[PDB]
Amino acid sequence: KHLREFVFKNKDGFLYVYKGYQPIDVVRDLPSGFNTLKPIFKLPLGINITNFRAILTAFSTSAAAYFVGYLKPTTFMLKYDENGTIT
Amino acid sequence: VLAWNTRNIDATSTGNYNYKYRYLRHGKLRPFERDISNVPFSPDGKPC
Amino acid sequence: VIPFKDGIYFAATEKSNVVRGWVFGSTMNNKSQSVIIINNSTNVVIRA
Ligand SMILES: *[C@@H]1O[C@H](CO)[C@@H](O[C@@H]2O[C@H](CO)[C@@H](O[C@@H]3O[C@H](CO)[C@@H](O)[C@H](O)[C@@H]3O)[C@H](O)[C@H]2NC(C)=O)[C@H](O)[C@H]1NC(C)=O
Ligand SMILES: *[C@@H]1O[C@H](CO)[C@@H](O[C@@H]2O[C@H](CO)[C@@H](O[C@@H]3O[C@H](CO)[C@@H](O)[C@H](O)[C@@H]3O)[C@H](O)[C@H]2NC(C)=O)[C@H](O)[C@H]1NC(C)=O
Ligand SMILES: *[C@@H]1O[C@H](CO)[C@@H](O[C@@H]2O[C@H](CO)[C@@H](O[C@@H]3O[C@H](CO)[C@@H](O)[C@H](O)[C@@H]3O)[C@H](O)[C@H]2NC(C)=O)[C@H](O)[C@H]1NC(C)=O
Numbered sequence: 001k002h003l004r005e006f007v008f009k010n011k012d013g014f015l016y017v018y019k020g021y022q023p024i025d026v027v028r029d030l031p032s033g034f035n036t037l038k039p040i041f042k043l044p045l046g047i048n049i050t051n052f053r054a055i056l057t058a059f060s061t062s063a064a065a066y067f068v069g070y071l072k073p074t075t076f077m078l079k080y081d082e083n084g085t086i087t
Numbered sequence: 088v089l090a091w092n093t094r095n096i097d098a099t100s101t102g103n104y105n106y107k108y109r110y111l112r113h114g115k116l117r118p119f120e121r122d123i124s125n126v127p128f129s130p131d132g133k134p135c
Numbered sequence: 136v137i138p139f140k141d142g143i144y145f146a147a148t149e150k151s152n153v154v155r156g157w158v159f160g161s162t163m164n165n166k167s168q169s170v171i172i173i174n175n176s177t178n179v180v181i182r183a
């Protein structure tokens with residue numbers, strides 16, 4: 001029913017978190033499209049992150065899925081609309 | 088960056104050894120990093 | 136356990152809210168600090 005999106009970055013002692021979502025109708029694949037996320041947290045943790053784990057829910061039992069990618073120092077051009085929305 | 092002398096506060100006649108610093112690590116720390124681990128150090132990354 | 140590699144992208148498809156949170160750290164144990172971020176259905180709670 002819904003796709004949740006997050007971005008996690010660890011920089012200068014801060015953990016940065018961005019969030020967004022959309023309605024979906026997919027079962028197994030990863031829906032293509034374009035969506036701009038917004039910032040939500042900036043945590044002054046000061047910690048060293050090299051690994052992570054997802055926290056799941058136990059049932060006793062439908063299927064569920066998630067996806068992981070990796071970020072790079074890449075150059076992008078962003079198109080801003082009249083109302084300041086990136087499209 | 089602000090600092091002041093605490094000879095009459097922290098220092099003691101017998102030596103105040105309640106403060107510590109790190110000098111060994113497999114590489115330098117990043118800016119604003121709180122590395123507070125404390126395990127035996129080994130010059131070539133081995134358990135010791 | 137999945138490598139962080141200085142920054143990740145995460146997404147999930149839900150119909151029953153299975154993924155509730157993440158744990159971020161290094162060695163991923165009590166020998167060092169780590170942060171737990173969870174949506175516990177009533178509150179979002181973050182602890183390090
Ligand atoms: C966060 O803590 C972890 C603790 O495991 C650190 O991971 C370790 O980092 C070193 C440095 O990149 C990794 O490479 C090692 O370098 C030394 C240099 O002489 C070399 O002798 C070792 O054989 C090795 O190559 C080491 O593999 C890595 N350990 C693991 C399990 O990944 C991590 O660097 C810390 N993060 C930060 C930002 O300091
Ligand atoms: C970004 O700016 C454009 C400027 O054209 C917005 O497009 C127009 O936005 C209005 C407001 O929602 C849309 O509805 C109109 O509301 C007036 C209210 O009285 C009504 O009289 C009109 O008949 C109409 O309902 C309008 O349809 C829309 N125009 C188009 C071509 O979509 C756009 O929505 C702005 N973006 C955001 C996110 O606000
Ligand atoms: C992280 O948490 C784990 C929890 O398992 C700790 O490992 C456990 O550490 C205790 C020592 O404190 C180990 O020995 C136990 O001692 C009690 C003392 O009465 C004894 O009753 C138990 O039967 C046992 O001997 C215990 O075996 C060990 N557990 C495992 C699975 O290794 C670990 O030390 C914690 N790490 C830190 C940094 O605190």
Ligand SMILES: *[C@@H]1O[C@H](CO)[C@@H](O[C@@H]2O[C@H](CO)[C@@H](O[C@@H]3O[C@H](CO)[C@@H](O)[C@H](O)[C@@H]3O)[C@H](O)[C@H]2NC(C)=O)[C@H](O)[C@H]1NC(C)=O
Nearest residue numbers: 055057155156171172173174175176177178179180181182
């Ligand atoms: C999901 O997260 C919420 C938010 O933390 C948990 O509910 C909270 O539980 C604490 C204690 O169990 C409740 O009492 C609080 O205690 C601290 C102790 O110093 C006190 O300072 C606070 O003023 C308060 O008294 C707290 O009111 C409660 N909050 C809510 C909204 O329920 C909840 O238990 C978590 N769910 C699970 C399954 O852990």
